[PDB]
PDB file of C-alpha atoms and ligand atoms in Angstrom:
ATOM      1  CA  UNK A   1      -1.604  -3.469 -12.839  1.00  0.00           C
ATOM      2  CA  UNK A   2       1.483  -1.954 -11.276  1.00  0.00           C
ATOM      3  CA  UNK A   3       1.763   1.175  -9.115  1.00  0.00           C
ATOM      4  CA  UNK A   4       4.708   2.525  -7.242  1.00  0.00           C
ATOM      5  CA  UNK A   5       4.971   4.416  -3.895  1.00  0.00           C
ATOM      6  CA  UNK A   6       5.490   7.993  -3.686  1.00  0.00           C
ATOM      7  CA  UNK A   7       8.728   9.250  -5.211  1.00  0.00           C
TER       8      UNK A   7
ATOM      9  CA  UNK B   1      -8.486  -3.467  17.824  1.00  0.00           C
ATOM     10  CA  UNK B   2      -8.627  -6.145  20.311  1.00  0.00           C
ATOM     11  CA  UNK B   3      -5.853  -8.982  20.757  1.00  0.00           C
ATOM     12  CA  UNK B   4      -8.160 -11.562  19.130  1.00  0.00           C
ATOM     13  CA  UNK B   5      -8.834  -9.550  16.140  1.00  0.00           C
ATOM     14  CA  UNK B   6      -5.024  -8.665  15.910  1.00  0.00           C
ATOM     15  CA  UNK B   7      -4.314 -12.388  15.919  1.00  0.00           C
ATOM     16  CA  UNK B   8      -7.091 -13.266  13.493  1.00  0.00           C
ATOM     17  CA  UNK B   9      -5.456 -10.567  10.976  1.00  0.00           C
ATOM     18  CA  UNK B  10      -1.998 -12.189  11.451  1.00  0.00           C
ATOM     19  CA  UNK B  11      -3.501 -15.668  10.645  1.00  0.00           C
ATOM     20  CA  UNK B  12      -4.979 -14.304   7.611  1.00  0.00           C
ATOM     21  CA  UNK B  13      -1.879 -12.694   6.531  1.00  0.00           C
ATOM     22  CA  UNK B  14      -0.041 -16.033   7.216  1.00  0.00           C
ATOM     23  CA  UNK B  15      -1.891 -17.363   4.023  1.00  0.00           C
ATOM     24  CA  UNK B  16      -1.132 -14.218   2.145  1.00  0.00           C
ATOM     25  CA  UNK B  17       2.571 -13.206   2.984  1.00  0.00           C
ATOM     26  CA  UNK B  18       5.280 -14.999   1.125  1.00  0.00           C
ATOM     27  CA  UNK B  19       8.876 -14.745   2.278  1.00  0.00           C
ATOM     28  CA  UNK B  20      12.001 -14.810   0.290  1.00  0.00           C
ATOM     29  CA  UNK B  21      14.207 -17.898  -0.200  1.00  0.00           C
ATOM     30  CA  UNK B  22      17.782 -17.629   1.222  1.00  0.00           C
ATOM     31  CA  UNK B  23      18.805 -15.348   3.823  1.00  0.00           C
ATOM     32  CA  UNK B  24      16.794 -12.291   4.947  1.00  0.00           C
ATOM     33  CA  UNK B  25      15.855 -10.078   7.989  1.00  0.00           C
ATOM     34  CA  UNK B  26      13.332 -12.225   9.669  1.00  0.00           C
ATOM     35  CA  UNK B  27      12.443  -9.830  12.503  1.00  0.00           C
ATOM     36  CA  UNK B  28      11.895  -6.863   9.968  1.00  0.00           C
ATOM     37  CA  UNK B  29       9.701  -9.249   7.862  1.00  0.00           C
ATOM     38  CA  UNK B  30       7.729  -9.891  10.911  1.00  0.00           C
ATOM     39  CA  UNK B  31       7.429  -6.330  11.853  1.00  0.00           C
ATOM     40  CA  UNK B  32       6.089  -5.664   8.296  1.00  0.00           C
ATOM     41  CA  UNK B  33       3.531  -8.306   8.857  1.00  0.00           C
ATOM     42  CA  UNK B  34       2.429  -6.999  12.270  1.00  0.00           C
ATOM     43  CA  UNK B  35       1.983  -3.513  10.720  1.00  0.00           C
ATOM     44  CA  UNK B  36      -0.179  -5.052   7.827  1.00  0.00           C
ATOM     45  CA  UNK B  37      -2.228  -6.681  10.491  1.00  0.00           C
ATOM     46  CA  UNK B  38      -3.758  -3.315  11.402  1.00  0.00           C
ATOM     47  CA  UNK B  39      -5.611  -3.341   8.125  1.00  0.00           C
ATOM     48  CA  UNK B  40      -9.178  -4.142   8.359  1.00  0.00           C
ATOM     49  CA  UNK B  41      -9.907  -7.873   8.503  1.00  0.00           C
ATOM     50  CA  UNK B  42     -12.468  -7.635   5.875  1.00  0.00           C
ATOM     51  CA  UNK B  43      -9.782  -6.437   3.271  1.00  0.00           C
ATOM     52  CA  UNK B  44      -7.342  -8.854   4.371  1.00  0.00           C
ATOM     53  CA  UNK B  45     -10.083 -11.733   4.157  1.00  0.00           C
ATOM     54  CA  UNK B  46     -10.749 -10.600   0.452  1.00  0.00           C
ATOM     55  CA  UNK B  47      -7.145 -10.699  -0.338  1.00  0.00           C
ATOM     56  CA  UNK B  48      -6.874 -14.243   0.862  1.00  0.00           C
ATOM     57  CA  UNK B  49      -9.935 -15.199  -0.907  1.00  0.00           C
ATOM     58  CA  UNK B  50      -8.559 -13.748  -4.264  1.00  0.00           C
ATOM     59  CA  UNK B  51      -5.231 -15.616  -3.700  1.00  0.00           C
ATOM     60  CA  UNK B  52      -3.416 -12.341  -3.599  1.00  0.00           C
ATOM     61  CA  UNK B  53       0.128 -12.896  -2.179  1.00  0.00           C
ATOM     62  CA  UNK B  54       2.117 -10.217  -0.482  1.00  0.00           C
ATOM     63  CA  UNK B  55       5.798 -11.043  -1.771  1.00  0.00           C
ATOM     64  CA  UNK B  56       8.460 -10.053   0.649  1.00  0.00           C
ATOM     65  CA  UNK B  57      11.807  -9.686  -1.109  1.00  0.00           C
ATOM     66  CA  UNK B  58      15.580  -9.600  -0.150  1.00  0.00           C
ATOM     67  CA  UNK B  59      16.686  -7.928  -3.414  1.00  0.00           C
ATOM     68  CA  UNK B  60      15.453  -5.532  -6.227  1.00  0.00           C
ATOM     69  CA  UNK B  61      11.941  -6.060  -7.452  1.00  0.00           C
ATOM     70  CA  UNK B  62      13.140  -6.648 -10.976  1.00  0.00           C
ATOM     71  CA  UNK B  63      15.190  -9.623  -9.936  1.00  0.00           C
ATOM     72  CA  UNK B  64      11.959 -11.564  -9.639  1.00  0.00           C
ATOM     73  CA  UNK B  65      10.998 -13.325 -12.985  1.00  0.00           C
ATOM     74  CA  UNK B  66       7.632 -11.739 -12.883  1.00  0.00           C
ATOM     75  CA  UNK B  67       8.887  -8.237 -12.800  1.00  0.00           C
ATOM     76  CA  UNK B  68      11.960  -8.560 -15.092  1.00  0.00           C
ATOM     77  CA  UNK B  69       9.827  -6.932 -17.796  1.00  0.00           C
ATOM     78  CA  UNK B  70       9.915  -3.796 -15.912  1.00  0.00           C
ATOM     79  CA  UNK B  71      13.769  -3.384 -15.873  1.00  0.00           C
ATOM     80  CA  UNK B  72      14.398   0.203 -17.121  1.00  0.00           C
ATOM     81  CA  UNK B  73      10.932   1.173 -16.955  1.00  0.00           C
ATOM     82  CA  UNK B  74      10.033   4.407 -15.201  1.00  0.00           C
ATOM     83  CA  UNK B  75       7.028   4.144 -13.016  1.00  0.00           C
ATOM     84  CA  UNK B  76       3.907   6.313 -13.447  1.00  0.00           C
ATOM     85  CA  UNK B  77       4.442   9.427 -11.683  1.00  0.00           C
ATOM     86  CA  UNK B  78       8.297   8.878 -11.154  1.00  0.00           C
ATOM     87  CA  UNK B  79       9.208  10.883 -14.541  1.00  0.00           C
ATOM     88  CA  UNK B  80      12.414  12.930 -14.072  1.00  0.00           C
ATOM     89  CA  UNK B  81      13.265  11.254 -10.661  1.00  0.00           C
ATOM     90  CA  UNK B  82      16.078   9.439 -12.657  1.00  0.00           C
ATOM     91  CA  UNK B  83      14.834   6.124 -11.199  1.00  0.00           C
ATOM     92  CA  UNK B  84      13.350   3.053 -12.672  1.00  0.00           C
ATOM     93  CA  UNK B  85      11.380   0.243 -11.376  1.00  0.00           C
ATOM     94  CA  UNK B  86      14.846  -1.445 -10.682  1.00  0.00           C
ATOM     95  CA  UNK B  87      15.259   1.130  -7.723  1.00  0.00           C
ATOM     96  CA  UNK B  88      11.671   1.163  -6.479  1.00  0.00           C
ATOM     97  CA  UNK B  89      11.343  -1.023  -3.279  1.00  0.00           C
ATOM     98  CA  UNK B  90       7.539  -1.577  -3.434  1.00  0.00           C
ATOM     99  CA  UNK B  91       4.879  -2.356  -6.109  1.00  0.00           C
ATOM    100  CA  UNK B  92       0.980  -2.790  -5.704  1.00  0.00           C
ATOM    101  CA  UNK B  93      -1.918  -3.417  -7.911  1.00  0.00           C
ATOM    102  CA  UNK B  94      -2.593  -6.954  -9.359  1.00  0.00           C
ATOM    103  CA  UNK B  95       0.202  -8.318  -7.298  1.00  0.00           C
ATOM    104  CA  UNK B  96       2.191  -6.904  -4.251  1.00  0.00           C
ATOM    105  CA  UNK B  97       5.988  -7.041  -3.823  1.00  0.00           C
ATOM    106  CA  UNK B  98       7.759  -5.343  -1.111  1.00  0.00           C
ATOM    107  CA  UNK B  99      11.697  -5.058  -0.350  1.00  0.00           C
ATOM    108  CA  UNK B 100      12.340  -5.939   3.353  1.00  0.00           C
ATOM    109  CA  UNK B 101      13.822  -3.127   5.430  1.00  0.00           C
ATOM    110  CA  UNK B 102      12.254  -0.224   3.232  1.00  0.00           C
ATOM    111  CA  UNK B 103       9.195   0.542   5.056  1.00  0.00           C
ATOM    112  CA  UNK B 104       9.877   3.691   6.443  1.00  0.00           C
ATOM    113  CA  UNK B 105       9.615   7.121   4.491  1.00  0.00           C
ATOM    114  CA  UNK B 106      12.803   8.041   2.885  1.00  0.00           C
ATOM    115  CA  UNK B 107      14.016   4.419   2.195  1.00  0.00           C
ATOM    116  CA  UNK B 108      13.819   4.982  -1.615  1.00  0.00           C
ATOM    117  CA  UNK B 109      10.278   6.242  -1.476  1.00  0.00           C
ATOM    118  CA  UNK B 110       8.296   9.003   0.451  1.00  0.00           C
ATOM    119  CA  UNK B 111       5.231   6.997   1.596  1.00  0.00           C
ATOM    120  CA  UNK B 112       4.386   6.981   5.038  1.00  0.00           C
ATOM    121  CA  UNK B 113       4.673   3.304   5.077  1.00  0.00           C
ATOM    122  CA  UNK B 114       5.779   1.172   2.043  1.00  0.00           C
ATOM    123  CA  UNK B 115       3.810  -1.982   2.767  1.00  0.00           C
ATOM    124  CA  UNK B 116       0.456  -0.344   3.575  1.00  0.00           C
ATOM    125  CA  UNK B 117       0.709   1.833   0.538  1.00  0.00           C
ATOM    126  CA  UNK B 118       1.490  -1.040  -1.800  1.00  0.00           C
ATOM    127  CA  UNK B 119      -1.177  -3.239  -0.312  1.00  0.00           C
ATOM    128  CA  UNK B 120      -3.654  -0.252  -0.421  1.00  0.00           C
ATOM    129  CA  UNK B 121      -3.004  -0.642  -4.354  1.00  0.00           C
ATOM    130  CA  UNK B 122      -4.064  -4.160  -4.390  1.00  0.00           C
ATOM    131  CA  UNK B 123      -7.059  -3.598  -2.205  1.00  0.00           C
ATOM    132  CA  UNK B 124      -8.208  -0.777  -4.400  1.00  0.00           C
ATOM    133  CA  UNK B 125      -7.666  -2.795  -7.627  1.00  0.00           C
ATOM    134  CA  UNK B 126      -8.552  -6.533  -6.569  1.00  0.00           C
ATOM    135  CA  UNK B 127     -10.905  -6.036  -3.564  1.00  0.00           C
ATOM    136  CA  UNK B 128     -12.651  -2.741  -4.319  1.00  0.00           C
ATOM    137  CA  UNK B 129     -12.841  -3.027  -8.326  1.00  0.00           C
ATOM    138  CA  UNK B 130     -10.784   0.209  -8.678  1.00  0.00           C
ATOM    139  CA  UNK B 131     -12.932   2.332  -6.408  1.00  0.00           C
ATOM    140  CA  UNK B 132     -10.119   5.023  -6.461  1.00  0.00           C
ATOM    141  CA  UNK B 133     -11.096   5.667 -10.082  1.00  0.00           C
ATOM    142  CA  UNK B 134     -15.144   6.081  -9.138  1.00  0.00           C
ATOM    143  CA  UNK B 135     -16.828   9.128  -9.496  1.00  0.00           C
ATOM    144  CA  UNK B 136     -17.401   9.376  -5.677  1.00  0.00           C
ATOM    145  CA  UNK B 137     -13.590   9.113  -5.064  1.00  0.00           C
ATOM    146  CA  UNK B 138     -12.646  11.574  -7.899  1.00  0.00           C
ATOM    147  CA  UNK B 139     -14.784  14.134  -6.302  1.00  0.00           C
ATOM    148  CA  UNK B 140     -13.277  13.653  -2.989  1.00  0.00           C
ATOM    149  CA  UNK B 141      -9.698  13.656  -4.612  1.00  0.00           C
ATOM    150  CA  UNK B 142     -10.463  16.734  -6.429  1.00  0.00           C
ATOM    151  CA  UNK B 143     -11.099  18.695  -3.292  1.00  0.00           C
ATOM    152  CA  UNK B 144      -8.584  16.953  -0.798  1.00  0.00           C
ATOM    153  CA  UNK B 145      -5.882  15.421  -3.039  1.00  0.00           C
ATOM    154  CA  UNK B 146      -3.303  18.132  -2.415  1.00  0.00           C
ATOM    155  CA  UNK B 147      -3.599  18.401   1.149  1.00  0.00           C
ATOM    156  CA  UNK B 148      -1.277  15.450   2.011  1.00  0.00           C
ATOM    157  CA  UNK B 149       1.870  16.797   0.273  1.00  0.00           C
ATOM    158  CA  UNK B 150       3.811  15.530  -2.727  1.00  0.00           C
ATOM    159  CA  UNK B 151       1.134  17.194  -4.796  1.00  0.00           C
ATOM    160  CA  UNK B 152       2.554  16.292  -8.183  1.00  0.00           C
ATOM    161  CA  UNK B 153       2.140  12.482  -7.334  1.00  0.00           C
ATOM    162  CA  UNK B 154      -0.804  12.223  -4.891  1.00  0.00           C
ATOM    163  CA  UNK B 155      -2.549  15.447  -6.261  1.00  0.00           C
ATOM    164  CA  UNK B 156      -2.411  13.924  -9.786  1.00  0.00           C
ATOM    165  CA  UNK B 157      -3.243  10.406  -9.545  1.00  0.00           C
ATOM    166  CA  UNK B 158      -6.385   9.373  -7.472  1.00  0.00           C
ATOM    167  CA  UNK B 159      -5.276   5.885  -7.070  1.00  0.00           C
ATOM    168  CA  UNK B 160      -2.074   7.180  -5.413  1.00  0.00           C
ATOM    169  CA  UNK B 161      -4.011   9.461  -3.233  1.00  0.00           C
ATOM    170  CA  UNK B 162      -6.331   6.495  -2.300  1.00  0.00           C
ATOM    171  CA  UNK B 163      -3.131   4.304  -1.555  1.00  0.00           C
ATOM    172  CA  UNK B 164      -1.304   6.935   0.584  1.00  0.00           C
ATOM    173  CA  UNK B 165      -4.462   7.965   2.440  1.00  0.00           C
ATOM    174  CA  UNK B 166      -5.211   4.417   3.244  1.00  0.00           C
ATOM    175  CA  UNK B 167      -1.542   4.251   4.614  1.00  0.00           C
ATOM    176  CA  UNK B 168      -2.205   7.104   6.856  1.00  0.00           C
ATOM    177  CA  UNK B 169      -5.317   5.501   8.096  1.00  0.00           C
ATOM    178  CA  UNK B 170      -3.932   2.202   9.213  1.00  0.00           C
ATOM    179  CA  UNK B 171      -0.376   2.739   9.976  1.00  0.00           C
ATOM    180  CA  UNK B 172      -1.006   4.167  13.678  1.00  0.00           C
ATOM    181  CA  UNK B 173      -3.035   6.557  15.758  1.00  0.00           C
ATOM    182  CA  UNK B 174      -0.952   9.454  14.810  1.00  0.00           C
ATOM    183  CA  UNK B 175      -0.961   9.181  11.127  1.00  0.00           C
ATOM    184  CA  UNK B 176      -4.794   8.193  11.418  1.00  0.00           C
ATOM    185  CA  UNK B 177      -5.481  11.648  13.328  1.00  0.00           C
ATOM    186  CA  UNK B 178      -3.449  13.413  10.699  1.00  0.00           C
ATOM    187  CA  UNK B 179      -5.609  12.207   7.905  1.00  0.00           C
ATOM    188  CA  UNK B 180      -8.837  13.117   9.632  1.00  0.00           C
ATOM    189  CA  UNK B 181      -7.563  16.699  10.016  1.00  0.00           C
ATOM    190  CA  UNK B 182      -6.199  17.158   6.657  1.00  0.00           C
ATOM    191  CA  UNK B 183      -8.560  15.228   4.588  1.00  0.00           C
ATOM    192  CA  UNK B 184     -11.916  14.746   6.396  1.00  0.00           C
ATOM    193  CA  UNK B 185     -13.788  13.618   3.352  1.00  0.00           C
ATOM    194  CA  UNK B 186     -11.365  11.094   2.752  1.00  0.00           C
ATOM    195  CA  UNK B 187     -11.293   9.908   6.014  1.00  0.00           C
ATOM    196  CA  UNK B 188     -15.007   9.588   6.399  1.00  0.00           C
ATOM    197  CA  UNK B 189     -14.879   7.661   2.930  1.00  0.00           C
ATOM    198  CA  UNK B 190     -12.459   5.048   4.382  1.00  0.00           C
ATOM    199  CA  UNK B 191     -14.316   4.765   7.596  1.00  0.00           C
ATOM    200  CA  UNK B 192     -17.538   4.092   5.550  1.00  0.00           C
ATOM    201  CA  UNK B 193     -15.667   1.658   3.255  1.00  0.00           C
ATOM    202  CA  UNK B 194     -14.710  -0.770   6.146  1.00  0.00           C
ATOM    203  CA  UNK B 195     -18.215  -0.992   7.582  1.00  0.00           C
TER     204      UNK B 195
HETATM  205 ZN1   ZN C 201       1.393   4.009  -5.123  1.00  0.00          ZN
END
């Protein structure tokens, strides 16, 4: 799983 | 949090945090570890037991062999930003990777704190078995997920609302108080999660 920060 | 507990958490992080090879900002790396040390020790110990590494980087995430496959890939929720993973300074989930110097809101992201937000993803996925997608948290997210701003990201993905709420809870006393006022059910949920 990969998740980014808030744009 | 007393001095002994902060020190214990830093000791735990010493077995989790990986520094880049070559030149990098040592003082800012240390500051990032100090901010991570405010996370409840129960979560840090679980990350250590699962051999989760918090990789601090001096360059782009996609310059690391294990993230090269994300070159040119637009992250979930970043549609229309014109950015790809090449441009994103932090990643969390099954791993954690963080660009040194990009902690603060506005440094290529709008999270309240990069390392706490990214590490929250790993705690959610690895330590808590995707609790952000549980029925309980989805019901909380349905009510409060649009009260922290960035509603087309935090209000749409429960795992992102969890990660950002976690960052508010653990960054400092001010952000902790803001979360309690904006998202009281989320705040109580996180409070009880740490018991
Ligand atoms: Zn995120």
